[PDB]
DNA sequence: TTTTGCCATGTAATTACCTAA
DNA sequence: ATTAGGTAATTACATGGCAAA
């Protein structure tokens, strides 16, 4: 898949929601899909990364 | 779906006893030697691991 | 017994998500 | 983003077995 960017609102909200939990359900990625208009693979990609930076 | 031959499940038991998990060497010579591809080799020791766990 | 018919089961293979590189 | 290997849960099959006329 692609190479994407994402918006500084997309960016806020993903930011918001790894604060309140680093993992994802599958109903909850969905509903995070159609409400940022993300791809489902791109935010579990971006979730995934995010954890990784954390760790170290 | 493949069935492994009574030789191939043996050499597989051994193999699992001295090791349960295959490095890409070790799991290399074993396909090599039983005429296995690489990929049946590494889903037979997955699922022999999982079913351990049951008992 | 013989023969016919269904089904429990062991197991190879697939799928989804994870970490770590 | 991609990649490999792991675990866990399923699925799809080849079988052997048991039931019963």
Same mark, same amino acid.
């Given at each position: 898949?692609?190479?994407? @960017?994402?918006?500084?609102?997309?960016? @806020?909200?993903?930011? &918001?929601?790894?604060?309140? *939990?680093?993992?994802?359900?599958? &109903?909850?990625?969905?509903?995070?899909?159609?409400?940022?208009?993300?791809?489902? @693979?791109?935010?579990?990609?971006?979730?995934? *990364?995010? &954890? @990784?930076?954390?760790?170290?």
């Amino acid at each position: 898949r692609p190479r994407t @960017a994402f918006s500084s609102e997309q960016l @806020a909200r993903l930011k &918001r929601e790894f604060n309140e *939990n680093r993992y994802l359900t599958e &109903r909850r990625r969905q509903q995070l899909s159609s409400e940022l208009g993300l791809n489902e @693979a791109q935010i579990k990609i971006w979730f995934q *990364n995010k &954890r @990784a930076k954390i760790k170290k």
